Design a protein around this ligand. Structure first.
Ligand SMILES: Cc1cccc(C)c1O
Ligand SMILES: Cc1cccc(C)c1O
Ligand SMILES: Cc1cccc(C)c1O
Lengths: 168, 168, 168, 168, 168
């Protein structure tokens, strides 16, 4: 690219991989959201929580794709793997799955930051710090808070209802 | 009728029957509503839920009667049978009874749609699709969601109170 | 009932009967209204007059049902008999039928008031006086005024049109 | 056409025919409107009624032409036959002629719907149901209501005047 | 009195007694209210419920005193007996005590109405019907509704908390 400067092929490839991970996360959250919208699950607050996260993850992917082009890299898309489960169990099970997912995204962000530092690419490092790393820490803290509250509420049916009504 | 066109006697009769079913449903919901207003039941959210449905079903009947006249058919009214119960048990029992009732109305709508299709009466088919079929699907989904939440809440007294307070 | 006080079984039963009479009146007015909406009758002011009365009578029934519960009585519903006619003739015939109907409701109100007085139930007596007796006197006077005007207008077709256009 | 999909030549031709029928109806209503504007007829409400219908029918034709292009069919225009009469008699005669005209348009709509169903063309079927079939049923009901009122008013001159003044 | 007309000494005395009963009820509610404000009871919604009732009963007494003077009777005050309890137990116990109290006031109202009827004093009868009898029926129905909800909630501590939070 006529504009490409200080942008390694290793970072370019890792950015494409991260786009795939964010889109896969978005898809997972779409599945989680609609599972809680089932008439035999019917926890609307939980459905809304996950549908909002599907949107956030898609936005993250789009920000990464915008950055790829700004740097003169070339977006390459791969298949989006279907989510790991078809049914997500209880709100507790779902929130545990979500925190696992977020920690995996966060690790990928940290890995890419480390690569950027090794390649002396401060624009990449700043980009990740500014738009992703703090968002992930905040989200993981929120999920941990939710998990603790869900666990303390498990009369499991009553607890699940109250969490959805009074927290979400 | 000077205006009657493509409107079979079979559909005309079936529309009159459907008016009766909607008015009977409205009456059933009136009974459900006032049962939950009893001082020894006293679940105001549940009373409101069913009184609103009584109004919706009456409106449905009135829309059908308007359509009967628009097509040049002749409204014929029959007795409105009293509701199947005098006392409706718990919120769970009542919501189960309501979903049974709605599924029976929906089946009648589907039967009339099938008759309209067989008689090549697209105005009737459109009318039902536009004003009734989706309303019924939405309502049945809502009732199913409510049933699931009520069931998960059954400390049955506490659960019944919380559902009325926090959902309805 | 824990709340029931000075409320006789005779009044409780008579209130349930009166609910049935009001709902039957509402149904009769629904039939009258839609008859005047027929394309071969087509008197919109008359249709509106009777549909408004259907609503008023239903509201009366609902007020009675509310009162039944306030007093600790138990609502019991019976079948709603179909209206006495399928076709209602001229506006004159219909208005005569309506005044007959209202006078029958008024007599039932007066009978219930008399029962309340005999049972020394002043809350019932006040309730009827406050919400029903004057409403009925006003409505019957209005119908009598309408009958007189309709009769003076009978060139019967022209008169019927003018009454609908200029009074209703 | 590059865009044409599931759109039969039979439906394409029938749509062109229907455009012609709607434009012919519009022309007929233009003639009716100006006849009632003659100084020796002079019924302004009747003139307005028919001029409004001329506009509605032209709009219907334009909607059909828009749809023809949306589907990749090719609009073909034919002569517009002059209306069946040069003078339209009384308001009663004119309203009878209008209801005959509307019933013929409605039959053409029903015929085209049947063709669409036979050709498994649900976009066409929906289009007609959504924009034409209910409009026609409503209009025919209104005309039938008007005919009944005009007939009841026939002192024919006085009745014609009053209908124009008080209904139209 | 120069103004006294159709106002018996029996009714005058009974009105003074009723003033005392209303003021005693107000005092009882003051005691109930402050009991629920104790730091070792601490149910603010319940405190508010009873303090509002203390105000309503005082207003009732003041209305009776105003009426006594309007009729030319002479207000005579007696001691106000201290409430029947110093401590009121649970919300359930308190609501039971309140409904007992209200039923006793209602019986006194009914007794005075009967006296008025026997003395042919229609102003008194109207006064009681208009300002007291329906208020009492409404309040007793509300208390019965509350009792039913409290009973269904008895995990008694949790139920008491939830009723205070979500109903009161
Ligand atoms: C491509 C994709 C997959 C899953 C969820 C979303 C929102 C999305 O855009
Ligand atoms: C139950 C019932 C019967 C007839 C008319 C009305 C409005 C109604 O609610
Ligand atoms: C005199 C009296 C006693 C108790 C409560 C109140 C409000 C009151 O005025």
């Amino acid at each position: 690219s006529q504009i490409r400067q200080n942008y390694s092929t290793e970072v370019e490839a890792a950015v494409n991989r991260l786009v795939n991970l964010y889109l896969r996360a978005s898809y997972t959250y779409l599945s989680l959201g609609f599972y809680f919208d089932r008439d035999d699950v019917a926890l609307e607050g939980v459905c809304h929580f996950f549908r909002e996260l599907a949107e956030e993850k898609r936005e993250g992917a789009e920000r990464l794709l915008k950055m790829q082009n700004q740097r003169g890299g070339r977006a390459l898309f791969q298949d989006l793997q279907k989510p790991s489960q078809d049914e997500w169990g209880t709100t507790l099970d779902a929130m545990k799955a979500a925190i696992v997912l977020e920690k995996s995204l966060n690790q990928a962000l940290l890995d890419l930051h480390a690569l950027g530092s090794a390649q002396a690419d401060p624009h990449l490092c700043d980009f990740l710090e500014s738009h992703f790393l703090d968002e992930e820490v905040k989200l993981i803290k929120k999920m941990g808070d939710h998990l603790t509250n869900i666990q303390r509420l498990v009369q499991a049916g009553l607890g699940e209802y109250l969490f959805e009504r009074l927290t979400l």
